[PDB]
Amino acid sequence: YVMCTGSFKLEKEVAETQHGTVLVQVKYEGTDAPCKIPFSSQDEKGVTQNGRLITANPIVTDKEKPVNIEAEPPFGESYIVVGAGEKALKLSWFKKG
């Protein structure tokens, strides 16, 4: 599939799991479903910052349906980036350790 082009709206609060991971549920605002969801994690200065995806591959099957995503963010201060372009969702997260 091609990367999603649309905008994202946050549907729920970000949550920390029992084992230091986060569950994010978002609502899609695009027209190109089905498409692959742009997902990346950075820091404050825009620097790409390592981490790993627990979810296989985040895809918008139906633009009217919210998608859940579990991820293991880097330690300390980071930004969760959902989507791409000017309207890209940027959410602050801290993981102690």
Epitope: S40, S41, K45, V47, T48, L53, A71, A84
Partner: antibody
């Protein structure tokens, strides 16, 4: 229509400093990061740094960190890059580029041919 | 710093024939399942122009004859049928870690 305008040429002395401008139009200047990249003859493209015009947060290439300064003027939607202690090795074509966050550069400036000479 | 090495330095391809250029990284440029690598095209007197993003995704406006593939440290750009206006210098770039780095550049000629 998105435009990133740069002056066509600069002539600067070795060891001196220069300040290059990039005038953005057609979009919200503070909504996108601005990067700077130079092209040297037979030496390819080199990344200098980036800045977020909204918050003035920035990041430099460590090679240039002691030598470069990224600034903006929101009022005129213009980003500036200053580089001092210039040598002949800094003769290049300098481009500003808009960051398609958080991936590639979507819009490139007109380019500024910089000559460091006396 | 992630170092990007392109191969070959230059090549000439007969008009209408297929061209292939490789870019290799000194370490992984993958970030959350996506390759943070991009392919740009630059012509003389002109600023660069994006062709490929995230290793394999075609930018809107780019002809379908252009394609990209690869992962981790090994990547390739392919033009299945070169044209006259395809003559340019091609560069790969990474942003998986600061500072951003560019490949050495591959120069494509059109073998009339």
């Amino acid at each position: 229509q998105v435009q990133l305008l740069q002056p066509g040429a600069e002539l600067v002395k070795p060891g001196a400093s220069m300040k290059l401008s990039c005038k953005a139009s057609g979009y919200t200047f503070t909504n996108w990061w601005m990067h700077w990249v130079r092209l040297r003859p037979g030496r390819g493209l080199e990344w200098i740094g980036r800045i977020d015009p909204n918050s003035d947060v920035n990041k430099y290439n460590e090679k240039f960190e002691n030598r470069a300064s990224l600034t903006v003027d929101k009022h005129s939607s213009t980003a500036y890059m200053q580089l001092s202690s210039l040598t002949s090795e800094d003769s290049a074509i300098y481009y500003c580029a808009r960051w398609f966050f958080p991936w590639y550069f979507d819009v490139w400036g007109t380019g500024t041919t910089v000559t460091v000479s006396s | 710093n992630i170092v990007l090495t392109q191969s070959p330095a230059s090549l000439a391809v007969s008009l209408g024939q297929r061209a292939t250029i490789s870019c290799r990284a000194s370490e992984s440029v993958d970030h959350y399942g996506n390759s943070f690598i991009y392919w740009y095209q630059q012509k003389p007197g002109q600023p660069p122009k994006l062709l490929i993003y995230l290793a394999s995704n075609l930018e809107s406006g780019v002809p379908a004859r252009f394609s990209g593939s690869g992962s981790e440290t090994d990547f390739t750009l392919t033009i299945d049928s070169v044209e006259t206006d395809d003559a340019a210098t091609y560069y790969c770039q990474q942003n998986n870690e600061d500072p951003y780095t560019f490949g050495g550049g591959t120069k494509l000629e059109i073998k009339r």
